[PDB]
């Protein structure tokens with residue numbers, strides 16, 4: 001193996017604390033704008049998100065801010081509250097080990113350009129040889145282009161790369177469809193449907209899967 005590719009959200013970090021912080025502000029701003037209750041604003045906002053699942057726009061918070069013409073920019077929220085982004089304890093030792101061992105490291109995310117800002121703010125950016133977001137290829141997982149462009153940039157063949165992510169449809173199916181090895185990270189004890197080549201609970205388990213020999 002020569003390269004390990006990572007999903008971001010739910011895989012190497014979580015933005016859930018930031019989501020918990022800004023959603024009430026969204027409900028506040030939306031209810032005040034539309035002259036409706038905060039509960040009705042919540043219903044409308046969340047319904048729109050659910051309605052656009054599995055689509056290009058689903059992975060972009062700014063899409064939803066813009067759709068409701070709200071005075072919010074996710075980049076500004078990120079820069080203001082970077083401590084609300086939480087890096088999993090198993091992330092940095094794993095990236096350190098992989099980089100030191102000689103693996104090329106890539107990010108493949110269906111989120112937009114601010115995903116790179118999230119990596120910068122959490123101190124993870126510099127571990128990666130390349131970071132590919134939706135906005136870099138005009139495509140989302142599991143479209144083959146987003147995986148193929150990433151490994152092309154890394155200079156490796158698909159069979160020389162492993163994808164690690166928490167989404168069965170985006171990460172596992174996406175990676176396998178272009179000939180990569182697929183590792184599903186399952187932090188919350190969900191159902192895996194017998195799909196991935198390997199299933200792990202934390203990134204520390206990658207050491208058992210890959211072994212320790214330099215590449």
Ligand SMILES: [Mg+2]
Nearest residue numbers: 007009010166
């Ligand atoms: Mg994810």
